[PDB]
Amino acid sequence: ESRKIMVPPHRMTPLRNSWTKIYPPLVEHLKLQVRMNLKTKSVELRTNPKGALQKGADFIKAFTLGFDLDDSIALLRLDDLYIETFEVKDTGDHLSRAIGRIAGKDGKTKFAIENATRTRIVLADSKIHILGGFTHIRMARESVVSLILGSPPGKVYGNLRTVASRLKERY
Amino acid sequence: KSDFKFSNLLGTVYRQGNITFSDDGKQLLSPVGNRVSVFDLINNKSFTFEYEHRKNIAAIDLNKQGTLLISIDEDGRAILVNFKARNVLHHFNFKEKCSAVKFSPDGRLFALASGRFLQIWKTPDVNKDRQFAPFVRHRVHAGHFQDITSLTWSQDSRFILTTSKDLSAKIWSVDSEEKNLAATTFNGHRDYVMGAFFSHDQEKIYTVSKDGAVFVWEFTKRKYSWRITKKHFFYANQAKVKCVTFHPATRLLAVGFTSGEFRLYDLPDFTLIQQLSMGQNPVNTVSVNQTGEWLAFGSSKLGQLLVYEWQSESYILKQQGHFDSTNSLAYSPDGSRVVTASEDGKIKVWDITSGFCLATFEEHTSSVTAVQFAKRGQVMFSSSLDGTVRAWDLIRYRNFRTFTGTERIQFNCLAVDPSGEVVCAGSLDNFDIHVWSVQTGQLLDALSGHEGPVSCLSFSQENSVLASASWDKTIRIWSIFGRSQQVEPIEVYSDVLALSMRPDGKEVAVSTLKGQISIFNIEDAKQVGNIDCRKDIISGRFNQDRFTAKNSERSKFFTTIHYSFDGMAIVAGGNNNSICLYDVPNEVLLKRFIVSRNMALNGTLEFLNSKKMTEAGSLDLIDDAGENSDLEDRIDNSLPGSQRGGDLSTRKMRPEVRVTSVQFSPTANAFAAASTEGLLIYSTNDTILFDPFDLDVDVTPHSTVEALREKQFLNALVMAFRLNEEYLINKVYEAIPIKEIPLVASNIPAIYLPRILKFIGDFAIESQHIEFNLIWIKALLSASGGYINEHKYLFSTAMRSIQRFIVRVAKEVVNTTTDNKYTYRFLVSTDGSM
Amino acid sequence: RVKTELRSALKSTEDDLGFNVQGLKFVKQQWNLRHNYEFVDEYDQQEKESNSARKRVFGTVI
Amino acid sequence: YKLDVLSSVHFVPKPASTSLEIRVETPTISMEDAQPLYMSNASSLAPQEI
Amino acid sequence: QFKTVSTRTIDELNDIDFNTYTSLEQIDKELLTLSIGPRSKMNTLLHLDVIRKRSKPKEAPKKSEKLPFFLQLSGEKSVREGIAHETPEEFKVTGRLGFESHFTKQLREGSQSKDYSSLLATLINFSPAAVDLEIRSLNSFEPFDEIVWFIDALTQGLKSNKNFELYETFMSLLFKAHGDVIHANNKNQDIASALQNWEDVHKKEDRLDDLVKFCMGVAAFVTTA
Amino acid sequence: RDWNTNAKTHTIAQRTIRCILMHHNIAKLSEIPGMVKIVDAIIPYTQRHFTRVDNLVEQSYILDYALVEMDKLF
């Protein structure tokens, strides 16, 4: 029993140079066997005779999606971690500057929402992936959807301050 | 009436010992001096245990069922208390100074570090009856060479890991069969080992010492025999570790130093999560919640208590009390909070139910001598030794007025107008009374005529006549208002301290230095009657003095007295450890309360143990301060002839026990006494003490519920009033329907009117049935609100308790629904377009 | 009759008083969330509000 | 300080100081101690001070 | 002295035998009744921003830099009962059907069944940070369903005359959080009708107002004069 | 704004503020340059007047108490 994760040709060279830190938790912590098909540009994970294949698939799928090495190791460990993918889909007007509104100047809005909601976000052209806990993904996604659908920067930043406080608060 | 019990201990959130949380960490248990306070932090309330150690307590633990507590004092007299019944189960004397006590996680054993022996006893049941000897000893291990500083149980209650002043730490199995798994000792520290903890899986052992090293011990090979794998250091140079704890599940090491700084680390990687400071005094206690989210720190020098959540960097509470330095108190005009004027120069406004301080005010640069409320809880006046009276708005929290004299004197007592135009203050070095207007700030008058220091001032609340009384053995009555400038001096037998004034202004009760409380008619200036109180005063013997408590003249008089609000009783306290209350018609002692049994305070024992009196001096006047482990308490910086200065380190004697102010509650049948241990709050409650009112043989709870089931509602209500049983009154009260509240409330007899009013008050403060309680209040005020007005002082504490319900829960709810109505009308009536 | 007409007049004036309170604080609050500033960090936020507060200086006596 | 404590705080006060205090505006929630409750939710400046 | 004994006669209404009376939950369905809980929960909800701003330390604590980013989630194995440690149970809106929260799922199911009793039970259950964090995230963007489901859930709530100070603060928290979008698409039919029937039930709350007005005015007159 | 500082001439100010609020656009009123140094000046005065008129309604119930006594008279 096996899984195949297709590595796109824009995350291929980081996979090869950081490959030597990717396969050791895949081959001794997880006890899988791992091959990298250079023909199909894919990663194959097979099970030996001696429920972790989905964990390894999510590990390399996070790296495939665009999350860094330590972020992917954080997904491989830390059972309470999830990752949500969505396109914008809500062109000059709407597509070419809603993503500029998520980013901001030097990505400071994305950095602010990452630190406020304790997720971390990779923003493609229009493909947003979010790695966090369940409630953390909920709040980061609500704020990202907010500032692609139109909200004032004061409103989204006040909501970010408030969500940081209430997510870290007991009671 | 007279059946007061010790309810609460306001002030002093922490004195000495370890903080504990509950298991479901809602309450925290804090060692105040020899009591234990328990503050419920979610249900915002608080209580203090009634029992009392004879010295300052040093160790606290309660098991994680929450069902029983054990508290050990600073020479090993343990007390096991039932935590739910609030009654003490056993008194057990361990023979020497126990550093720590801990229950097991499975509750069934406890262990304690008595000297250099770790002794494990097994916990008696809460369901079993009290025996002569309930504790059955499991074992006593002796492997340390000096005193043990800490215990730690493992997660399974299987091993125990103890840390000593001797520079090691040891692990002991509980039972004999696992003796080979736990026989190692952990050396390598340069100083006292302050803590030794397991990891979550019990594979790593962390040992933290006083000099600042934490060692990680692992069962590895260099066979397998507990190597040390990494030493981490705090590198705090001058400061050193005072308290350590570890939450093993969240891997959180919390460490407090002797400089107020505490750091909290994520331990096996040793990454500083946070570092911040309580203050400048050392952190004597760190304790952690069961989920590891709250950290309670206690510093013992200023008596302060933090609980702090480290994720959301925020203080759940940051409180600080006052040991021994509290000059005055005043109830708020509804009995919800008490204002405390304290000798370090500050005002503190303590909530009574939740035992915490809401606001504090530091604008006096010296010891605040008196506080007094005015303008019905809106303004509050205080006078201090720095020469100033000043006024405080309790809305905007601003000192808006400051009154000085012209002569540079220090003020010791004050009195405000009812119609608060004029404040008045008297000193102990000037013989005049200073009369200031409050509207403008000027000095309106200086009343003269005493030939001795004006000890006490009070304005009559009804006819507004001023009564001052001074150490020239004279009470004096000044008609200030309206063209009189009239003075009436009443002489009395000895020099007066603590005048007090009836709520109707008819009479004035003075306390004298003879030991008596004399009561005078104001308008016809002749004595109505006196109480002779100097033979029902408990005056203890100090340690330093060479004259018996019988022949002493130190404290056989009352320096503070106060009327009850029906005018019929006087509570009184002084520089002695008895507070006494009397009923002024009969001039007889209703009840006397022993305010402390702490032998760490001075004037408590009347008879001192003759074993402690040696061939040269008593053994408690010998200062063993250089036998101390470090310099900051080997230091003696007590300048010699200092009495009642500041900074308890600067006086060299034991703190004497004394009550500095007594006041009755304006709303509910209680009194507060500002002792040295804190604000002692004594209150009755009607749940206990069957005290009927003219019942006959046919008046019975069975008869009352038959009359309720047969729906004679008025007969059921008056049967429950004649029972005077709180559950029965509540049952009938809730069973009467809304259709006939006004018929019952109009047919209530007039002798049961203060009972139903004070019941509705003490019920409706916390009950949820807001419209039911307001229907009953409306029906009672409409049906019988003329009897109340012509019998004001009977319903003077039952009506103040009712408008403590209307303005404090019902008006807040009405404010919320009003704001919702108006935001709706705006949000739908106006134009939001772009 | 006096009770009904007097209380009707008083509730009629405090109706528009409460309306104006909630409307004016809505106006101020939507101006704030339009263009107040951008601080997510609470310490920099509280120092920004302390620098932008209303100050008034009072003559106290020591 | 130590002369007052030695004198057992019977002293004669400092003469006079008409000082000058700046108070910012803020909620009196924020002007309080750290505890779960509060006592007043006004603003520290009067309407005639705003 | 440690337990309570029954005053029931030996020879040779269990609350009345044990001298207690557990006060019943509400006396009549036409009577307003607060929550069975602390009185301070209303004030904590209404002003929890300024209370926490008070509760912050005066300067920022000294952390490290090589601190793990998922420190709140990286526990071990006394279990945390917050809104952050909440797992989903068991095709793109703000919350998919695999990633619906408990509050949003119960709100939707109550919008199906037209009975929000379980929603209101969850609301009266959880803590003020959880209440603010659930009300502040309520899909105020394209068709406005979750806002109007919350509003007529509060309508069904304060029709029942229980917990009504909490239902009042939940409406205040709604108007505070995103009453600007309700003011924006004012005259929208669904949200205007939801506010209309909320006002239809809420306008019968002046019983409490003139009841406390009578009690305050007459109590003051009787005590002073 | 400066009529609302009286307790006498304040009703005229409240009616004019109310008709401005219910006849203009709220986004326009907010984004006019200068309309926060006015509405922050006159929120606390309206709150002061709300407290005063609400206490007038509170002490208006002595008429209701006198009526219930006058009906108890027989």
UniProtKB/Swiss-Prot annotation, chain B:
- What is the organism of origin for this protein? Saccharomyces cerevisiae (strain ATCC 204508 / S288c) (Baker's yeast)
Keywords assigned: Nucleus, Phosphoprotein, Repeat, Ribonucleoprotein, Ribosome biogenesis, rRNA processing, WD repeat
Highest taxon of the lineage: Eukaryota
Checking InterPro entries in the record gives: Apc4-like_WD40_dom (IPR024977), G-protein_beta_WD-40_rep (IPR020472), PWP2 (IPR027145), Quinoprotein_ADH-like_sf (IPR011047), SSU_processome_Utp12 (IPR007148), WD40/YVTN_repeat-like_dom_sf (IPR015943), WD40_repeat_CS (IPR019775), WD40_repeat_dom_sf (IPR036322)
Functional summary from the UniProt entry: Required for bud-site selection and cell separation. Also involved in nucleolar processing of pre-18S ribosomal RNA.
> Which lineage ranks, top first, belong to the organism behind this chain?
Eukaryota, Fungi, Dikarya, Ascomycota, Saccharomycotina
* Other facts noted in the record for this chain: Present with 16700 molecules/cell in log phase SD medium.
Keyword Repeat part of the UniProt annotation: yes
Q: Which residues carry this modification: Phosphoserine?
A: S629, S642
**Subcellular compartments:** Nucleus, Nucleolus
Q: Where is this region: Disordered?
A: 631-652
Family, according to the entry, reads as follows:
Belongs to the WD repeat PWP2 family.
The Gene Ontology CC terms held by the record are:
90S preribosome; cytoplasm; nucleolus; nucleoplasm; Pwp2p-containing subcomplex of 90S preribosome; small-subunit processome
Annotated membrane-spanning segments are none
List, in alphabetical order, the Gene Ontology terms for molecular function in this entry: mRNA binding
Name-wise, this protein is Periodic tryptophan protein 2
Swiss-Prot record, chain D:
Q: Where in the cell is it found?
A: Nucleus, Nucleolus
From the Swiss-Prot or TrEMBL record, give the protein name: U3 small nucleolar RNA-associated protein MPP10
Instruction: Give the source species.
Output: Saccharomyces cerevisiae (strain ATCC 204508 / S288c) (Baker's yeast)
Q: What is the lineage of its organism?
A: Eukaryota, Fungi, Dikarya, Ascomycota, Saccharomycotina
Top-level taxonomic group = Eukaryota
Write out the similarity annotation: Belongs to the MPP10 family.
Quaternary structure and interacting proteins, as annotated? Component of a heterotrimeric complex containing IMP3, IMP4 and MPP10. Interacts with snoRNA U3. Component of the ribosomal small subunit (SSU) processome composed of at least 40 protein subunits and snoRNA U3. Interacts with the SSU processome subunits EMG1, IMP3, IMP4, KRR1, NOC4/UTP19, NOP1, RPS4A, RPS4B, RPS6A, RPS6B, RPS7A, RPS7B, RPS9A, RPS9B, RPS14A, RPS14B, UTP1-UTP18, UTP20-UTP22 and UTP25.
The entry's function note states: Involved in nucleolar processing of pre-18S ribosomal RNA. Required for the early cleavages at sites A0, A1 and A2 during 18S ribosomal pre-RNA processing.
Curated annotation (Swiss-Prot), chain E:
Phosphoserine PTM positions read S78
User: Subcellular localization, per the record?
Assistant: Nucleus, Nucleolus
Q: What is known of its domains?
A: The WD repeats are grouped into two tandem seven-bladed beta-propeller regions.
Q: What is said about its interaction partners and assembly?
A: Interacts with snoRNA U3. Interacts with MPP10. Interacts (via WD repeats) with UTP18. Component of the ribosomal small subunit (SSU) processome composed of at least 40 protein subunits and snoRNA U3.
Q: Further notes on this entry?
A: Present with 2020 molecules/cell in log phase SD medium.
Q: What does this protein do?
A: Involved in nucleolar processing of pre-18S ribosomal RNA and ribosome assembly.
Q: What is this protein called?
A: U3 small nucleolar RNA-associated protein 21
UniProtKB/Swiss-Prot annotation, chain F:
Annotated compartments? Nucleus, Nucleolus
Q: Which residues form a coiled coil?
A: none
Assembly and partners? Interacts with snoRNA U3. Interacts with MPP10. Component of the ribosomal small subunit (SSU) processome composed of at least 40 protein subunits and snoRNA U3.
Additional information: Present with 8070 molecules/cell in log phase SD medium.
General function of this protein = Involved in nucleolar processing of pre-18S ribosomal RNA.
Under what name is this protein listed?
U3 small nucleolar RNA-associated protein 13
Gene encoding the protein: UTP13
